[PDB]
């Protein structure tokens, strides 16, 4: 793919006291002579990562990959979402979104042309 293998796992609480937010454990690893070096893990909020998942579709409306989710229809993507924005049904549900986040992330990180946006190319490592 691109010698880059990141795995998003569980959503831990960052803030505390009134309004706490969850981070994203993106342990990307690419020994290639591009960036990262020695691989590692970065912590960022969903509101930030969303910029990709959201922008990804912004590229078009019908033609040109009209599926924000993983490279292709992997159930989680499009099937019976019905709703639009976030809703969350249970605590574990929050983790379900994390997993898919890596699936879609792999595609963008996979192809340098896919990301396109200078931010997306550097979003996989976006800290804060």
Swiss-Prot record:
<comment type="subunit">
    <text>Predominantly forms heterodimers with BAR domain-containing sorting nexins SNX5, SNX6 and SNX32; can self-associate to form homodimers. The heterodimers are proposed to self-assemble into helical arrays on the membrane to stabilize and expand local membrane curvature underlying endosomal tubule formation.</text>
</comment>
<feature type="domain" description="PX">
    <location>
        <begin position="2"/>
        <end position="128"/>
    </location>
</feature>
<comment type="similarity">
    <text>Belongs to the sorting nexin family.</text>
</comment>
<feature type="binding site">
    <location>
        <position position="97"/>
    </location>
    <ligand>
        <name>a 1,2-diacyl-sn-glycero-3-phospho-(1D-myo-inositol-3-phosphate)</name>
    </ligand>
</feature>
<feature type="binding site">
    <location>
        <position position="45"/>
    </location>
    <ligand>
        <name>a 1,2-diacyl-sn-glycero-3-phospho-(1D-myo-inositol-3-phosphate)</name>
    </ligand>
</feature>
<protein>
    <recommendedName>
        <fullName>Sorting nexin-1</fullName>
    </recommendedName>
</protein>
<feature type="binding site">
    <location>
        <position position="73"/>
    </location>
    <ligand>
        <name>a 1,2-diacyl-sn-glycero-3-phospho-(1D-myo-inositol-3-phosphate)</name>
    </ligand>
</feature>
<feature type="binding site">
    <location>
        <position position="47"/>
    </location>
    <ligand>
        <name>a 1,2-diacyl-sn-glycero-3-phospho-(1D-myo-inositol-3-phosphate)</name>
    </ligand>
</feature>
<comment type="function">
    <text>Involved in several stages of intracellular trafficking. Interacts with membranes containing phosphatidylinositol 3-phosphate (PtdIns(3P)) or phosphatidylinositol 3,5-bisphosphate (PtdIns(3,5)P2). Acts in part as component of the retromer membrane-deforming SNX-BAR subcomplex. The SNX-BAR retromer mediates retrograde transport of cargo proteins from endosomes to the trans-Golgi network (TGN) and is involved in endosome-to-plasma membrane transport for cargo protein recycling.</text>
</comment>
<feature type="modified residue" description="Phosphoserine">
    <location>
        <position position="47"/>
    </location>
</feature>
<feature type="modified residue" description="N6-acetyllysine">
    <location>
        <position position="96"/>
    </location>
</feature>
């Amino acid at each position: 793919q691109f010698d880059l293998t990141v795995g998003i796992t569980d959503p831990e609480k960052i803030g505390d006291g009134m309004n706490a937010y969850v981070a994203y454990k993106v342990t990307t690893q690419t020994s290639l002579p591009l960036f990262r070096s020695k691989q590692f893990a970065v912590k960022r909020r969903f509101s930030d990562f969303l910029g990709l998942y959201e922008k990804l579709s912004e590229k078009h409306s019908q033609n040109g990959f009209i599926v924000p989710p993983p490279p292709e229809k992997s159930l989680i993507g499009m099937t019976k979402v019905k709703v639009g924005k976030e809703d969350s049904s249970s605590a574990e549900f929050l983790e379900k979104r994390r997993a898919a986040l890596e699936r879609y992330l792999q595609r963008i990180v996979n192809h340098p042309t896919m990301l396109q946006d200078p931010d997306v190319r550097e979003f996989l490592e976006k800290e804060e």
